[PDB]
Amino acid sequence: RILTHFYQGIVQQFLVLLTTSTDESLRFLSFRLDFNEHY
Amino acid sequence: PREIITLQLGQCGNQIGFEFWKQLCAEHGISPEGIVEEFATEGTDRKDVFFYQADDEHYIPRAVLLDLEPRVIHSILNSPYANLYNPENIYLSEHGGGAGNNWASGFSQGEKIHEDIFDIIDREADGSDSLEGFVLCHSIAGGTGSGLGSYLLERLNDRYPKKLVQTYSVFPNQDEMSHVVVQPYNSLLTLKRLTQNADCVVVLDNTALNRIATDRLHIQNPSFSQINQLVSTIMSASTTTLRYPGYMNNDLIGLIASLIPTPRLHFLMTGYTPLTTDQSVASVRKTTVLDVMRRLLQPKNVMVSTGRDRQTNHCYIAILNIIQGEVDPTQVHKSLQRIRERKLANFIPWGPASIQVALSRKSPYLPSAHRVSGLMMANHTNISSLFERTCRQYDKLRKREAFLEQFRKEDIFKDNFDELDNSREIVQQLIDEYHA
Amino acid sequence: ILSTGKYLNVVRECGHDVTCPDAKEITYTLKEQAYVERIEKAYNYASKVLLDFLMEEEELVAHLRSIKHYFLMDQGDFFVHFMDLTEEELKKPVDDIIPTRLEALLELALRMSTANTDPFKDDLKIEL
Secondary structure (H helix, E strand, O other), rough: HHHHHHHHHHHHHHHHHHHHHHHOOOOHHHHHHHHHHHO | EEEEEEEEOOOOOOHHHHHHHHHHHHHHHHOOOOOOHHHHHHOOOOOOEOOOOOOOOOOOOOOOEEOOOOOOOOHOOOOOOOOOOOOOOOOOOOOOOOOOOOOHHHHHOOOOOHHOOOOOOOOOOOOOOOEEEEEOOOOOOHHHHHHHHHHHHHHHHHHHHOOEEEEEEEEOOOOOOOOOOOHHHHHHHHHHHHHOOEEEEOOOOOOOOOHHOOOOOOOOOOOHHHHHHHHHHHHHOHHHHHHOOOOOOHHHHHHHHOOOOEEEHHHHHHEOOOHHHHHHHHOOOOOOOOOOOOOOOOOOEOOOOOOOOOOOOOOOEEEEEEEEOOOOOHHHHHHHHHHHHOOOOOOOOOOOEEEEEEEEEEOOOOOOOOOOEEEEEEOOOOOOOEEEEEHHHHHHHOOOOOOOOOOOOOOOOOOOHHHHHHHHHHHHHHHHOOOO | HHHHHHHHHHHHHHHOOOOOOOOOOOOOOOOOOOOHHHHHHHHHHHHHHHHHHHHHHHOOHHHHHHHHHOOOOOOOOOHHHHHHHHHHHHHOOOOHHHHHHHHHHHHHOOOOOOOOOOOHHHHOOOOO
């Protein structure tokens, strides 16, 4: 359970930096990651 | 996001909501069984605010329809608009009810089907993680819509406390008292629940319907097939900021927040002028916005039976004037310029008033993108005349020994009649006190 | 001469085949207002092909529509959702990964309440 809590904090830290868009088709990359975790 | 669940209930509440959903497909450019037009996304920029969000571009209605009478639902499935409705969200085939005509019937039937009535209507609640609220599209006439509708105004107040409640309720007819005689009893029992167990209402009088139904509509025998035409347009007119893309008060908690002065003062007067099809041949010459709101404050389009000589000591506090479609917005501030010169609205002497005007583009359709439409949501303090009309018909009936022995056999042991009388007079006294 | 001169450099940047003449060669009468006739002949074709170019393809009307929707703030269905999400993240001092999560909420709501067209509204970059 501590490792699942470590895992979910990494994937939250993933999607934050993936929404930190520098915009050279980075809007395309931020589109794909919220689609995976929610759908 | 902004998903609202409509609670269609009763013999009259199911029919006024049936053509309300039927009105929405003609303006969204969609069919109830398919998508044949591409006008749904390029013309309309928002569709998932009253419908359920799509799984196959099939916008399911977020609607529930319960009634004791099976006659209102058997006139639905043969119509080709019932395939848009789902036979698993509310009921499957052969749904029934009571016998049945009583206010105490549906008031006692709410806690015996308590497990099933809070099971399938809550499945649509968690579809969106930010629920707007609940609108009880119910009736006051009869014992079907008034008996069961008073129960859900109590148990949804604490189970869903952070949600907006506001209803488009229709008032019954007070012409003669032969077919129904239980009309003063079931109306005032629901009217108490509409003020303290409910935030806002939208009143819709029945004696004011045939005032308009013979005004320009030219009928000789008044039928029930005309009651759905005045009601379904102003329902879709009230959500034009909410369905179509608007900016300010584009939510249902936006419009109602800017009009209610205080709790137990929420009865809003409604007005809607354009209902005639032969006006279409002369709207080609740029009919402007400068003449459409001069007749809204003039008591001609009102749907509330009120006194004509009682408006001098009463004062408007909040008045809404909604223009739709083609507005020509370079003269919409010009229309609001002419309001202060006439002073057709009496203003409250203790505080400021407000004439709020808003606009939104209508459907990409030829009767909609050509003719000007004006929706009024007034709030005037002459609404106690209806409350004086209902109370004078209430205490006169209790002195005639009418329905005091025929009404207290089931689930009524104490006299709750003056519990409704004082709370109604509390509304009538705080209205006149509100202008100091 | 320079306003038509800086003009011709842009049309060369569009393409080499697209030039502005419309061939008004041998010119320059000895007499006095020779200049201004050749000024308007170049300036009125500068009126021509740029009504042809930018309104048709480079879409200054369609850019300025979406320019007027997110600073002058029309299209208030998508907009009020993202201002609620921006308010939730700006009620505290920001951390390092917080601006990246702010940028993830921008294009999320674009396909929630749809705009006029969604891959054209990707010109919005977030700053503080």
